[PDB]
Structure formats: C-alpha cells, structure tokens
Amino acid sequence: APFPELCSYTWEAVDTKNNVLYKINICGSVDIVQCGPSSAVCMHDLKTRTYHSVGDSVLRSATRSLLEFNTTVSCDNHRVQSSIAFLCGKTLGTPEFVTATECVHYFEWRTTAACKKDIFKANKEVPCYVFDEELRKHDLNPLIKLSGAYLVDDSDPDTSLFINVCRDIDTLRDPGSQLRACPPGTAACLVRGHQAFDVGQPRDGLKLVRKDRLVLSYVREEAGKLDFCDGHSPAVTITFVCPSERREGTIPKLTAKSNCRYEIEWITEYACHDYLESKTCSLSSIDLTPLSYISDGKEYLFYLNVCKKQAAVCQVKKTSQVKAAGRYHNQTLRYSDGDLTLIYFGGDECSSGFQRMSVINFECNKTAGKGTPVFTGEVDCTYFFTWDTEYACVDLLCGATDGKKRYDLSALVRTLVCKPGDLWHTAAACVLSKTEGENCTVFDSQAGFSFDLSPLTKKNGAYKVETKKYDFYINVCGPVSVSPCQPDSGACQVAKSDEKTWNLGLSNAKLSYYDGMIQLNYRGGTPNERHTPRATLITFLCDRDAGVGFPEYQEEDNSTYNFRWYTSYACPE
Ligand SMILES: *[C@@H]1O[C@H](CO)[C@@H](O)[C@H](O)[C@H]1NC(C)=O
C-alpha cells in the first residue's frame, strides 16, 4: 500500500477534543526535527506544545484495508503505534482521526488512491484542504468535479475559461460536450472557438493565505506554445473565500487575464469551516436507527446490532470460542468532514492488554434495501468494517446562468423578467453586461445604477503598497505624486534593494464594470523587445463593510502588475 498519489505531501488530521494535530507522511517522513528523523506519523498536541512520533516510517506494514506504522516506545502490551483504515473514494481526500489510547492512534482515509481500478483516479490531483490558526479545517473536496468543469465568468464573448478544483478536468465522461479539445491533464482550459489550450495544471496543494483566504495555483512551465502569451508562462491562481453578509456569494469570476496570468476569485460556502460527535445513534442530518448482521472474517465471523450480555459486535470462530468486540453505552458516533464513523469500546480484553474495539466506516450508497457491513481488518484488537448504506447519505446561489449569459439579484436584498432600469419586473432580472465609463465613473445601464470611484482619486497619489522587495505607489483615476516617479504614471514600482523605478502605466479615469467588478487599466509604462510597454490592472471588488479599503499586489511574473481593491465603493448602495 505505497499509494503513489499520497507521496510528496505531509497530510494533516485533527483530534478536536484533545486539541492535537497529527501529521501523516505515508511515503517518507514528516520534515520536523522536533518529531524525529523517521516519523511517518506525528503527534503535536498544541495544548502544551510538545512532539511525539507515534509511527516510524521504516516500521511499516499493511493488513487488508490498514496501513500501520510502529515505534519502539513503551506505554501500557507496550509498543506505541498508528494505523489508517483505507477505503476507496471519489477524490484524493484527507485522513480523519478516529481515536487514540496511550499506545494506539487510529485513522481512516477515503481516497482514490485506495481503489484497485485506475479509471476512477485523476491524471493528477492535489490536497484540497488546509488547517487555520485554530485547527478549524477548510476543505474543497465537495467542489471537485469527476467529469466536466466550471465555466469561469468573464464578459468576453469570444473565449471561455474552464476549471476544476484541485485536479485535472476529465473530458471523456461527456463526449461531445464542449471540452473534448482540452489537452489531457489540464485543470484550467482556455477555449477560443474550436481550439483548446492548457493554461494551468495541478502542482502544489491548497494554501491558506492571510488568515481566511484559500489560494490554489495552477501552472505550466513544462511548456511550448506562448503564441498569445508573449513569452509568459500560463498560470491560474484561484482565491476561494468564505461567504458573509459582506461578501456576495458567487460563481467563480475572472479578475485578471493579462499575459495569460489568469486570476480567479470564488466566493463559495465550501471555503468555510464542523466535526460533530455523539454517544447516541445519531447527530444534531440523519439517524442510523432504521438499520441481525453477519460479517465474515478470516478464521472468525462477526455479528452486529443497531445500538457480554449486551455486545454490539460479536466475534466467534468458524471453535465456538466467542468474544465481544463492542459494547452499547460506551459508543461514539461522529461526522468528520464528510465521513461518518461509529465506534464501540466494551471489549473483552484479548491476550494482550487491550479491550476489543469495533470501528465502522459508513459509506453512502442508495443501491445498497438497507446495506451490509464488510470486515476490512484488525489491529491490536480493533476490528474495522465498511458499511455501504443509503441511511448514511447527507452552494445556494442568488442568480442563475445561461449559455454564457449570467444573472444576479443583489440590489433587491434588504417569476421576474427585467425592465429598463426600474429596479415584479425588475432591471435586476435579465443579462449582465460589460459597460465602460470615464471621469472615474461607469453606468450599468441594465441594473439602473452607476458606480463612481472618484473619492479614492488622491491629490498627491501616495497609496503605499510594499512587497518585500518593491514599493508600489499607485493612485485611482488620477496620477501618482511620489519622490522618484513621474507625475505621469498611475502606478509605479520601486525596488528597495536598488531604488530603481518603473512606470507601470499612465493614469486615466476610464472605469470598466462587469458583474460586480470595476477595472482601471493604465497602458503607458516602460518597455520582450517587440515593444511591450508596462501596464497595470486594478480590479475593484464590492465588500459592504470594507469601506474605502486598500490595494493589494497580486503575485505573478516579473512582468505583470495586477492589484486588487476590496472596497464598498464597488457595491450597489
Ligand atoms: C453501492 O452498492 C452496489 C451494490 O451492488 C454496488 O454495485 C456499487 O458499486 C456501490 N457503490 C458505491 C459507490 O459504493
């Protein structure tokens, strides 16, 4: 069970009560020296910051569904250990913590990498989760598409940008439907008509940036082409954002697309953090009461009941020596990020010091007509079962979409066809459309309201943006007005290393508007020796409670200069 697809990454799983993070490295070693040179599983336990390797990379073995890592440490029999129960899954997934004693530490992982046919596997998929400062857990595996992709919103009628979250786009399981042309392995495909291009491919996993912003980056350096990418390496950077009363809630939106450096922002509920728990046969949502049962073993044979005199799980040998492998009272039902896991603890103490536990991994399956538990292995008197059942079967948009034509209600937030700007027939109803203005204003004639950014326009244009290398000075609609730059430029780069500056483009007040984005483009700027004068993009984005806000430089090429500006000036009010 090497599972190549799980190499190269140091996964994370959390135990929410004890307040511990474990770091799993199945193919190698956690790269923490505090943990130790040969840790494949690592206890942190933030609460009293300490470290313990509860699994050595060398001392590894499999057993049916399980992978297990041993260590040469006494406890109490005596040896400390960690194990993962592997189930097949639709995405690469994450490991979820099950339970721990002073010796054993158990997990389960539902993943593509535990399927014995590769048709289900992605050309390339990446970890689609992160943990924040309070080990909360943000995870976008629900967004991952198995076939097809997400049309990214952009006014341009000619070209369309499709993406998948954390993996390549499977174009085969819908033959004929628009995407066929897309080069194999692409997570970001650019259609221009009948021709398709790979503008992005998975490499690293999901990142957490500035507290609460998930960033995912696709790249393509192993490349050619650059017909229209002027010697730029095509790249995609998506920013997932947890909705709020402030932040709209949306489909994904193209905020930049110069130099084949696509920048997408996507307000989606799956960006928010959650780990439920109960000693009952249900949670806060479905009950497991509707679910006597006879699971076959090696030498042995199992018997299980809904919810020892009692015994919820019973082992007998096919030899009528019988042992109980799970009580009734001592129970824990748990929903951990999509995974429903029931445990029993009762346990007749086996030869060794432990009491027999049963861990059941309920999978969702309609065509089960209830469902049946399969035995999937045993480790130090803990018996694992996977249960396909319908009774374990458990992203609300304000605006719809057309053959590329969007719709959005927002100014109607304290059947409808639209009306000329009236705002029940309402301007808010029908198609969204790009409009351009000037004098630091733009009028969305459809919706009936116009935006005016003019109060940002500074009279000596010090807006002060520090990269740890450069000091960008910019201004809105008006020009800059700072030490080295010309009073010409609306944007200006200045290295602190040197002090050497570059005009990033001449200012103008020619606003653009489309689907809640406002855009300033400066086009002068210092010259690749085709001509290539520098330019700046500044996408302004509605945030009801951002106020005026502040610009933020978007990391790209040496050569590309996009800033973002969250501000309530881009909002309808
Ligand atoms: C659900 O159970 C049926 C039983 O025949 C099986 O065919 C199918 O593969 C199962 N699906 C999943 C996703 O477990």
Residue numbers in the entry: 8 to 83, 88 to 284, 286 to 296, 303 to 309, 316 to 331, 341 to 351, 354 to 403, 407 to 432, ...
Please share excerpts from the published article on this structure.
Delivery of these newly synthesized hydrolytic enzymes to lysosomes depends on the P-type lectins, 300-kDa cation-independent mannose 6-phosphate receptor (CI-MPR) and 46-kDa cation-dependent MPR (CD-MPR), that bind the carbohydrate determinant, mannose 6-phosphate (M6P), on lysosomal enzymes. CI-MPR’s extracytoplasmic region contains 15 homologous domains called “mannose 6-phosphate receptor homology” domains (MRH) due to their similar size (~150 residues) and conserved residues, including disulfide bonding. CI-MPR has four non-adjacent CRDs (domains 3, 5, 9, and 15), each with distinctive phosphomonoester and phosphodiester glycan preferences. We now report the crystal structures of the N-terminal five domains of human CI-MPR, revealing the orientation of two CRDs (domains 3 and 5) with respect to each other at pH 5.5 and 7.0.
Crystallization screening of human CI-MPR domains 1–5 protein in the presence of 10-mM M6P resulted in two conditions yielding diffraction quality crystals. Interestingly, both conditions show evidence of the N-glycan at N591 of a crystallographic neighbor partially occupying the carbohydrate-binding site of domain 5. The pH 5.5 structure had sufficient occupancy to allow carbohydrate refinement while the corresponding region in the pH 7.0 structure did not. The other CRD (domain 3) remains unoccupied in both structures, unlike bovine CI-MPR domains 1–3, where we showed domain 3 was bound to a ligand: either M6P or the oligosaccharide of a crystallographic neighbor (inset). Although we were surprised that the domain-3 binding pocket did not contain M6P at pH 7.0 conditions, the presence of the N-linked glycan near the binding site of domain 5 could perturb conformational equilibria between substructures that stabilize a domain arrangement most favorable for crystallographic packing. The interdomain linker between domains 2 and 3 adopts a more extended structure in the absence of ligand, allowing for the repositioning of domain 3. In the absence of a ligand bound to domain 3, its C-terminal face contacts the C-terminal face of domain 1. The flexibility of domain 4 was also recently demonstrated in the cryo-EM structures published by Wang et al. at the time of this paper’s submission. Comparing their bovine domains 4–14 structure at pH 7.4 in the presence of IGF2 with our human domains 1–5 structure at pH 5.5 or 7.0 shows domain 4 rotated ~180°. Another possibility is that PPT1 binding to domain 3 causes a rearrangement of domains such that the binding site of domain 5 is no longer accessible by ligand. This latter possibility of allosteric interactions between the CRDs is consistent with our crystal structures that illustrate that domain interactions can be dramatically altered in the presence or absence of ligands, such as between domain 3 and domains 1 and 2.
